[PDB]
Amino acid sequence: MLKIIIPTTMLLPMTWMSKHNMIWINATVHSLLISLISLSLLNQLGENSLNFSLTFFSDSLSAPLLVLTTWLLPLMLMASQSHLSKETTTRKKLYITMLILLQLFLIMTFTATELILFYILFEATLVPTLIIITRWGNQTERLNAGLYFLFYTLAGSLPLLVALVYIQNTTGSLNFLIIHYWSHPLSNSWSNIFMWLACIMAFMVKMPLYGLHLWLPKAHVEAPIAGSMVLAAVLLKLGGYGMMRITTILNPLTNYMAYPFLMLSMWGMIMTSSICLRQTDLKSLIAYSSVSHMALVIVAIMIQTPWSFMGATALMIAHGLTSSMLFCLANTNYERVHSRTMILARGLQTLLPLMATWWLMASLTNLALPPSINLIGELFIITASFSWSNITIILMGMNMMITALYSLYMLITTQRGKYTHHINNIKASFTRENALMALHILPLLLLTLNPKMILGPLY
Amino acid sequence: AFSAPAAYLTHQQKVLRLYKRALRHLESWCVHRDKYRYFACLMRARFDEHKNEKDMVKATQLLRQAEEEFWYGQHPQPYIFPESPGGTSYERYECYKVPEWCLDDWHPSEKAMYPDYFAKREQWKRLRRESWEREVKQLQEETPPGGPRTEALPPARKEGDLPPLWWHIVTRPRERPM
Amino acid sequence: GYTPDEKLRLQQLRELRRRWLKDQELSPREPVLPLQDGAPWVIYKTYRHSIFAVTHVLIPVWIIHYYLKYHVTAKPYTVVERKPRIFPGDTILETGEVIPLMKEFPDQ
């Protein structure tokens, strides 16, 4: 894994020692080359994981996420170029360094073979994200959003640290391979119940769960474009990755303990999709849609069936791409009109035609038009839940309908109608923004042709 | 082009609007022209019957009862002119309408394709830029101390002065832009 | 009816609007920047028709038949055809034959 890690680390000295003109160019070029290197990890032996070393391993679950992060870094730099132009060279380099540290931490989290190291790196991501949000946000609420994000995540995580240390003491090892191979069943005792809660709750917080999702809207709304992109695409997926990894330890109690979170996620998906219908801010609407899709992912993980896990992996990747693209599309309008109110900018299809097509494709993926990977994941999850209970179809179908409604309502309001007369600052879309949208869309559409890559280990 | 509205509708204006609505809905019910003409003459006679009522209370009660009759007798699907609000073609060409300010963002190569037009556009821009100050001064002068109490805007008092706040009305997108 | 100010304002706006509309009219010159295809009289009658036929139907048909060669042989059961109906008639492979009793009463 050092083939990827070491170059990512060298990205920092290059960025710091690069000329003021050339920071973005060098960062983008070398990040893209690193992403190209990451594509080698997609080749996964079916039976066994790629155990590169004692510290690091990759499987059919970690590989797609690593590729996603490496891909995301250059898109994040491209998106963040515009609003950081006025910033001084040192601050721009610090922002790029925060992004690079975040990528390094995420890669090590995904490839780490020990749960304690995974915890250290997974919590470590808070610092760069917190710094980004609270230093390069454009609103007074960036500080409160940072406090909420940090404290929600830490309150979830710390009991996880206690539980992991206890597991290390009892089983004797926190290496995932040994844990999987031995994996003695849990007993239905209050102590084991609370251990299950401690293990699950941190990832339940990271993956916005209904009742623990309040941090996500504030953080995504108040964060800069790059921070929103990472939070939606990758940081949420850390919870899913950990929950899929951690579920091995808690085999039997999961059936008994799943019902509260299963019900919360299933009803919350409807609740948040309905929330999206009446939201007045584009970023907030995108965030709530993210919440709903991650609720679908949570249901898939809790059910603990192979098809559900494959759907969860596919949905994680597809949603990361789609939500990042949606945030970037909203950010372009925000830069042009300097407001996140949906009503303020209208009829943008006439003014900016190609951005309208980008919006259409992003919304279609959001509403799971087949054969999109979004639909593949959602359909697999839906079938697994149908096996879990035939009555599940009602809520899932209602959620599908509400998702289509809110996605196309966003598209109609922002990109359709008569243009807002007074707004005169709309200017022809730059090649950079269209290139960012295309870089988002094309990999998602291409991944449909070969869907085994994003279908996870159980495939 | 719409005239500024008044605070209230006069009794005569309300009666006229009721007359127009009744005639149009009758035409909707009376599809054939001859029947429409006969019943329309009937309606005109109906209005003429109380045209000259002296008591305003009685006339107001008559208008109220006539409106109730209209609501009972309104055609469920009244004819709407194709381009009128509620019509089949209302706002159909809205997307094709594009604001004038967009042309400023054209690439120089694109503006080269239509040189004379952009020269004329520069002339119009000069006219607006010169006229703005005098228009603001005139609007300030004519405006009452409390403030503008109606949406109506004054015409140009002196030669060489354009009507105040004229740009958007004059340069509004064409009805059928294509 | 119109107030005098309303009439004057509307007439001035009419003049300005008509001037703007006339200005929007294009001149006799609309400079288009100035032959990648050297086919000046391309037989409009048939060359386009045959070229379209070949490009749209003939090439795809060749490609699809070659793909039929690839896919049928590579994988069993890729193409499955409903078994042809067999009436009291001869069969090519085994040259078998049969008749349907014919004891049926002919009159109807």
Binding site: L351, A428, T431 | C102, D105, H107, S109 | E25
Partner: peptide, 12 residues
Amino acid sequence: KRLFIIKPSGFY
């Protein structure tokens, strides 16, 4: 009677 068509810049 050709009339200029007001459309957004398509060059970019």
